[PDB]
Amino acid sequence: NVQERIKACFTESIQTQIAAAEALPDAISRAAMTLVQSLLNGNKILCCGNGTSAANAQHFAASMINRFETERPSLPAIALNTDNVVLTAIANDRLHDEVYAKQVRALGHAGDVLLAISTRGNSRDIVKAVEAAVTRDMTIVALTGYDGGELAGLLGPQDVEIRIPSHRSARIQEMHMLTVNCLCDLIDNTLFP
Amino acid sequence: NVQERIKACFTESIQTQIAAAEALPDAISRAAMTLVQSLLNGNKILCCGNGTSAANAQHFAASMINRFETERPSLPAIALNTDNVVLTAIANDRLHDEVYAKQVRALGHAGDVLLAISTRGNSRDIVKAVEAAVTRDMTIVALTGYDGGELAGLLGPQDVEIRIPSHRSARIQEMHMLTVNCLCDLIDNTLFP
Amino acid sequence: NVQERIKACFTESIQTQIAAAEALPDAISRAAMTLVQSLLNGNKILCCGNGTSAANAQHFAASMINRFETERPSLPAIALNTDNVVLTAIANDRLHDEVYAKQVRALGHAGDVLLAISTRGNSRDIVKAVEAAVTRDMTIVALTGYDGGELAGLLGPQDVEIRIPSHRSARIQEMHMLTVNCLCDLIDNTLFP
Amino acid sequence: NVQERIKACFTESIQTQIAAAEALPDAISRAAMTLVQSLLNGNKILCCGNGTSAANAQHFAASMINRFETERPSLPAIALNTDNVVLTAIANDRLHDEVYAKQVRALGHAGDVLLAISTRGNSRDIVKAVEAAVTRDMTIVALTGYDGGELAGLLGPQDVEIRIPSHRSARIQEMHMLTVNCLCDLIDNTLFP
Ligand SMILES: [Cl-]
Ligand SMILES: [Cl-]
């Protein structure tokens, strides 16, 4: 009955992906257009997330800087959750909520995109990255789940939320990796048919 | 027809997950038992991977050290692909293939597990981590795809290969995240019902 | 007068290093003996720090795992401030003070050493790493400055504080890198004359 | 006579710092002016290094993004040796020498600075970061030792080499941390007297 639990886990995933295929392609499409437009304008994509969403952010970053599938030029994407010295320096001062906001304020240019990844969309550090990006006239592409959290409360007319239809963090994280992969596909197919 | 590409990408994923649910539960089961046994013996799990597989490794590590879902004690797992100072120091000497093997040799104890994650199973650095782990009398749980690569050539009777049935790296990486999530489920359900 | 400021900065450093050469060799000696003894017993060294002290920790870790100068076997040292996915997962749950304590609890064995590096010795996350290490019957080698902070309040008869005689963080950090280098020297000269 | 070795190590350091105070303030001055000018033009500083030089790079990055001493706005500096997922993805493709060059090509703008840190200045990955930065019309501030290596062979009229007068890597690394600290001092004193 280990085999049963494994079945259940696989099942729940498949059900989630089916529901996401029905609900998300318009949002994915919009996000992809935003990322493509920013990159075409010579802008870059700043990415942030915590935990597994940090891993997903780095996944995006690497797909852009190195490659997704096609040999093509390196594209400008930075994950803000990788420099442990920066992150812990800010935490050491007592500024845990500003770990990504400081980076966005120092590095963001108008026309850049903040790709913000969160399962619940509630963490204060991500909220603040988004609100410093808005300040900087960047557009937001948010990957979320549950009800979208504080994060979805922050998005304006130009911004895009991709809200996985799931109240389960593990499933949400899996859908975020797929979503990022569908985005890299679109981006490469568009910029380098 | 952006919506079509997105459909195709979602489709290919769902097809992969279905085929993995049919083919992998015995292997996942075996891996889970190995990880559980090692942890019960007071041992730890060393994890390594490159690129997105590095992200997947860290995902595992974090699920163990922090939590997967249930509040329970931190469990000992280390990703060997996180200390950038260590990794680049070894690359700076001209030892790129030893970046993980040195770590396994310094840190591994008999009875530990090396969770090795690779889409093709061919990278020399992962091959060598596995072969230093074998030396150290560790057991190997390999997450692979394609035909399993050099990596699958290295596994003995006690070791476990989880070979995603896919010749597509993006799909393989997605299945690796799911597999890790099904493993953390099993591990928690077993050790902390 | 840029050249003057540079002179002043160089001067202050030299003055600090002179004062540290007078005050610290007994402490450095003791620390070195502790690290050597633990390593001889088959134990490992866990390292933590924030910001520049995180960099100094990784410096130690790399000197052990890869090499300091002499080609010799990789030695077991881990910096707990490198896995960004682990660290941010714990911060994402609201447990910022436990980022290193969870790692020490999961990974530490009696007889291991925690090399704790802090300019003031006040950060709650480092305090707690030290107090979980004590629990685990590990010995502490603390690199500190100012008055040693909460950290120096935690050390027992077996533990070692190396307190740089400086109330200036930049100077303290420089002395920490030197101290780590003098330690790697001792360790190699002792274990591999 | 442990106390003697410690004395020797402290001595050699002090001798190095004295010789650097005599030889380097013009170069430090020039570098500081370059970094200040680039930052004034709205540009950013990309930093790279391997091993301990990676740690030194992150130290710089954190001093800029967070703070050096004075509370003041976050300044744009990025270390290219922190995203382990990016770095290992490129190493996984067989492109070890391009790990930083891809990042510089994707991210660099004319007028930016590449702060390149190396004890010998020979590693191919750093050589190539520098030569992609030159392509991108960035200025180079190189922190080196020994004879400056291939790296010093690459610098043009606008670029700055800070060559620590030492043929000893540990001493060189210590002087690099001091140099970075003297630079952050200058930068803050200039931009925010
Ligand atoms: Cl261990
Ligand atoms: Cl930029």
Cβ neighbours for A171, distance < 8 A, ≥ 6 positions apart: A12, A13, A16, A145, A164
On whether any CB of chain D is under 8 Å from the CB of A157, the answer is no
Q: Which residues of A touch C50 (CB under 8 A)?
A: 88-89, 91-92
Tally of CB atoms within 10 A around B102: 24
On whether any CB of chain B is under 8 Å from the CB of D33, the answer is no
Q: Report d(CA A57, CA A48) in Å as an integer.
A: 6
Q: Which residues of C touch D170 (CB under 8 A)?
A: 68-69, 181, 184-185
Tally of CB atoms within 10 A around A31: 27
Phi and psi dihedrals of C121, rounded to 5? 75, 25
Separate counts of helices (H) and strands (E) for chain A:
8, 5
Q: How far, in Å, is the centroid of ligand 2 from the Cα of A100?
A: 15
Q: Among all ligands shown, which has an atom nearest to the Cα of B46? A: 1
Name the experiment that determined this structure. X-ray
Question: Which residue in B61, B85, B93 is closest to C85 by CB distance?
Answer: B61
Q: Report d(CA B134, CA B8) in Å as an integer.
A: 41
Q: What SS3 class is residue D164?
A: coil
* Pair A143, A126: CB distance under 8 Å: no
- CATH (domain of A146): 3.40.50.10490
Phi and psi dihedrals of A109, rounded to 5? -120, 145
Q: How far, in Å, is the centroid of ligand 2 from the Cα of C90?
A: 30
Q: With CB atoms and an 8 Å threshold, state whether A90 touches D66.
A: yes
Q: Among all ligands shown, which has an atom nearest to the Cα of C42? A: 1
Enter the DSSP assignment of B44: -
Instruction: Return the H-helix or E-strand segment holding D46.
Output: strand D45-49
Q: How far, in Å, is the centroid of ligand 1 from the Cα of C108?
A: 7
Q: CA torsion, points D173, D176, D180, D185, in degrees to nearest 10?
A: 110
Instruction: Return the H-helix or E-strand segment holding C143.
Output: strand C139-144
Enter the DSSP assignment of D45: E
Enter the DSSP assignment of C118: -
Size of interface A-C (CB pairs under 8 A): 56
Q: With CB atoms and an 8 Å threshold, state whether A10 touches B51.
A: no
Q: Report d(CA B78, CA B80) in Å as an integer.
A: 6
* Pair D70, D190: CB distance under 8 Å: no
Q: Which of C120, C92, C118, C90 is nearest to C104 (CA)?
A: C90
**Resolution (in Å) of the shown entry?**
1.9
Please spell the DSSP secondary structure of B73-88, one letter per residue.
----EEETT--HHHHH
* Cα angle: C96, vertex B177, B139; to 5 degrees: 95
Q: Report d(CA A50, CA B106) in Å as an integer.
A: 30
Q: Among all ligands shown, which has an atom nearest to the Cα of C136? A: 1
Q: How far, in Å, is the centroid of ligand 1 from the Cα of A104?
A: 38
Q: How far, in Å, is the centroid of ligand 2 from the Cα of D112?
A: 9
Ranges of beta strands (E only) in B42-191 are: 45-49, 77-79, 113-117, 139-144, 160-163
Q: Which residue of chain B has the CA closest to D82?
A: B84
D30 vs C92, D9, D38, CA distance in Å? 43, 30, 12
Q: Which residues of D touch C169 (CB under 8 A)?
A: 69
Q: What SS3 class is residue B4?
A: helix
**Mutant choice from B80, B88, B90 vs D, greatest count of D C-beta within 10 A:** B88
Q: How far, in Å, is the centroid of ligand 1 from the Cα of B45?
A: 9
Q: Report d(CA D96, CA A153) in Å as an integer.
A: 43
* Pair B171, A71: CB distance under 8 Å: no
- The three-state (H, E, C) secondary structure of A103-135, written as one string: HHHHHCCCCCEEEEECCCCCCHHHHHHHHHHHH
**Touching subunits for chain D (3+ Cβ pairs under 8 A):** A, B, C
Size of interface A-B (CB pairs under 8 A): 115
Q: With CB atoms and an 8 Å threshold, state whether D9 touches C185.
A: yes
On whether any CB of chain B is under 8 Å from the CB of D55, the answer is yes
The pairing of strands C77-79 and C45-49 is parallel
Domain around B40: 1-193
Q: How far, in Å, is the centroid of ligand 1 from the Cα of D81?
A: 27
The pairing of strands A113-117 and A45-49 is parallel
Q: How far, in Å, is the centroid of ligand 2 from the Cα of D104?
A: 11
* Pair D47, D20: CB distance under 8 Å: no
In total, chain D counts a number of residues equal to 193
* Pair B60, B79: CB distance under 8 Å: yes
Q: With CB atoms and an 8 Å threshold, state whether B174 touches A178.
A: yes
Tokens linked to B58: 């860290």
The pairing of strands C160-163 and C139-144 is parallel
Enter the DSSP assignment of B153: H
Count up the domains in chain C and report the number.
1
Q: Buried (b) or exposed (e) across B5-39, using 16+ Cβ within 10 A?
A: bbeebbebbbebbeebbeebbebbbbbbebbbebb
Q: Which residues of B touch A86 (CB under 8 A)?
A: none
- Min Cα distance C135 → chain D (Å) is 31
- Min Cα distance D173 → chain B (Å) is 13
Q: How far, in Å, is the centroid of ligand 2 from the Cα of A107?
A: 6
Q: Tokens 């400056």: give the residue.
A: D148
Question: Which residue in A3, A5, A174 is closest to B177 by CB distance?
Answer: A174
Tally of CB atoms within 10 A around A105: 20
C180 alpha-carbon distance from chain centroid: 7
Instruction: Return the H-helix or E-strand segment holding D116.
Output: strand D113-117
Q: Buried (b) or exposed (e) across A157-171, using 16+ Cβ within 10 A?
A: eebbbbbbbbebbbb
Q: Which residues of C touch B65 (CB under 8 A)?
A: 83, 86, 89-90, 102-103, 106
Ranges of beta strands (E only) in chain B are: 45-49, 77-79, 113-117, 139-144, 160-163
Q: With CB atoms and an 8 Å threshold, state whether D177 touches C174.
A: yes
Question: Which residue in B52, B54, B85 is closest to D55 by CB distance?
Answer: B85
Q: How far, in Å, is the centroid of ligand 1 from the Cα of D24?
A: 44
Q: Report d(CA A168, CA A52) in Å as an integer.
A: 13
**Mutant choice from A3, A4, A6 vs B, greatest count of B C-beta within 10 A:** A6
Q: Among all ligands shown, which has an atom nearest to the Cα of D138? A: 2
Helices (H), chain D: 2-23, 25-40, 52-65, 84-92, 101-107, 124-135, 149-153, 169-191
**Mutant choice from D7, D13, D14, D33 vs C, greatest count of C C-beta within 10 A:** D13
On whether any CB of chain A is under 8 Å from the CB of B185, the answer is yes
Q: Which residues of D touch C15 (CB under 8 A)?
A: none
Q: With CB atoms and an 8 Å threshold, state whether D81 touches B81.
A: no
